[PDB]
Design a protein around this nucleic acid. Structure first.
Length: 50
DNA sequence: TGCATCCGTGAGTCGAGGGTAATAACTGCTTTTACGAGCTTGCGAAAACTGTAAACGCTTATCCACCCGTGCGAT
């Protein structure tokens, strides 16, 4: 009752939040630096770290 | 004199299957290094040709002694 089972769909979800933190670095470092009246969301979002 | 932080230990053969990925600038300007191009020597081959002591087969000049050109003889 003190030990718990963590299967594939949970361990793949913990590893998807780790990749999404790398979005929270590069987005907050783009909304202050980058242009405003031109920037689409496809431009700022990377695909490699996630 | 404990008390608290710290350094250093932890069996052996095999085995299977393999190697990663986040993100980073543009410009003009000047010096160095490579790549292909075109010669210059030179070096190993091909194809001819002028010096010597044997160089493949083959004639003679000799000498001489087996044999016998013949004759005549042996019982």
């Amino acid at each position: 009752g003190n030990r718990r089972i963590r299967s594939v769909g949970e361990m793949a979800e913990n590893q998807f939040r780790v990749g999404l933190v790398r979005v929270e670095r590069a987005v907050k470092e783009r909304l202050s630096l980058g242009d405003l009246d031109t920037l689409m969301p496809q431009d700022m979002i990377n695909a490699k770290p996630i």
